[PDB]
Amino acid sequence: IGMKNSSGVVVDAYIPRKCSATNRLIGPKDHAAVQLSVARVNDKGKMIENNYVTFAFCGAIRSRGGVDSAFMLLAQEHGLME
């Protein structure tokens, strides 16, 4: 990722996360944006497995209210929780 310089080393600086659902860069002042994590579980003795898939949703997505449907959809297509 990053804006590479002619020498082949990224110059840029901080790299913003992109919202999982709509791929709009989460901006520095996107205070509304949140990045919750869903816990994978074992077959039986369901327990936190020490690794959480990480999912980001920007505030514009949040305002639409689409995050809840997109979040459910995101797990089912990606498997993971659903």
Within 10 A of 67 (CB to CB), how many other CB atoms are there? 22
Within 12-71, the residues that bind RNA by CB under 7 A are 60, 63-64
Give me the sign of the Cα torsion angle 10, 6, 27, 66: negative
Closest approach of Cβ 72 to another protein, in Å?
Answer: 7
The span from the first CA to the last CA of the chain, in angstroms, equals 29
43 in contact with another protein (CB under 8 A): no
Q: Indicate which of another protein, RNA, none lies near residue 14 (CB less than 5 to 8 Å, by partner kind).
A: another protein
| Site size with RNA, rule: CB under 7 A | 3
